[PDB]
């Protein structure tokens, strides 16, 4: 009974319906069971990995790999380069293909609707460009795979620590080898150019930290003696290599936020405003796509 992932907020009153869905419950329930997964623990922890994670972590390799099988033009040319465009096709191709390493035969119908999630996280092919919205779906794509039963909960640290933390380096790759933008006002009022969810599970990870307090992530010094263990830092130091200037001048929403007192409160004023500035905002999270194992009627209680 599996379907092709369809658009399903079309208009601002679209919202309502969203945030109503067994979807939007079940993604944000998904995102808080693996937030809580990761609480006080080190990148270096010890965690079970199953073959699942070992076929995941290989399909993103791939999708690395095809990077270096295609080098950015040596035109002029002035946003992001356009042999994004040539990446891009390459996963739109070769998505299902992909997921099919990963899913049982007896799953096959599955592919289609779980491959579509694939194909919407890593940026837009026009525009050249990535923000929240494709790291939501790329979320959505973990979650359908938990839904079926290939993603297991005894993997749920597996799923952060190293496929997603996976993902953040395929993305950066992508983010510096084709010059991306960031989506639309994601360098505006954002918390960062591209991502979000790893400040949440990255806070998460420095919960009860002896001495690293939310205030250090700004010492650079700091960063650089850390990041290897923390997803929270390793975001900041991939900022601090791409913007130009002072800290609160190019981050000032994170700027504001090391001053919390602590990693729990910074973790709870994420939770929120990745509610506010991401999930409820109309223009970042229309483009959600809505199918069986992520449905868009209402949440059956």
């Not at 592919?111 to 194909?119: G, N, Q």
């Not at 969810?197 to 001495?211: K, M």
């Not at 981050?251 to 709870?268: C, D, E, G, Y």
């Amino acid at each position: 009974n599996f379907i092709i992932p369809k658009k399903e907020i079309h208009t601002v009153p679209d919202m309502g319906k969203w945030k109503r869905s067994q979807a939007y419950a079940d993604y944000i329930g998904f995102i808080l069971t693996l937030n809580e997964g990761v609480k006080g623990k080190k990148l270096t922890f010890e965690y079970r990995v199953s073959e699942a994670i070992e076929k995941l972590v290989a399909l993103l390799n791939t999708l690395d790999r095809w990077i270096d099988e295609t080098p950015p033009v040596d035109q002029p040319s002035r946003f992001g380069n356009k042999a994004y465009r040539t990446w891009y096709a390459k996963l739109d191709e070769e998505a299902e293909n992909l997921v099919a390493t990963v899913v049982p035969t007896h799953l096959a119908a599955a592919v289609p609707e779980v491959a579509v999630y694939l194909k919407e996280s890593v940026g837009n092919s026009t525009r050249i460009d990535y923000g929240t919205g494709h790291e939501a779906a790329f979320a959505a794509f973990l979650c359908c795979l938990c839904k079926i039963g290939v993603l297991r909960v005894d993997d749920q640290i597996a799923i952060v620590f190293k496929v997603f933390n996976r993902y953040l380096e395929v993305m950066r790759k992508l983010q510096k080898t084709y010059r991306m933008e960031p989506a639309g006002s994601q360098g505006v009022w954002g918390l960062d150019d591209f991502q979000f969810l790893p400040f949440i599970w990255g806070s998460s990870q420095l919960i009860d930290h002896p001495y690293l307090e939310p205030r250090h992530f700004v010492d650079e010094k700091a960063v650089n003696e850390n990041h290897k263990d923390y997803m929270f830092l390793e975001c900041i130091l991939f900022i601090t290599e791409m913007k130009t200037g002072p800290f609160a001048e190019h981050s000032n929403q994170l700027w504001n936020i090391s001053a919390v007192p602590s990693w729990s409160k910074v973790n709870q004023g994420l939770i929120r405003m990745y509610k506010a500035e991401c999930l409820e905002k109309f223009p970042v999270i229309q483009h959600f796509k809505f199918g069986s194992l992520l449905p868009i009627h209402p949440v059956t209680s």
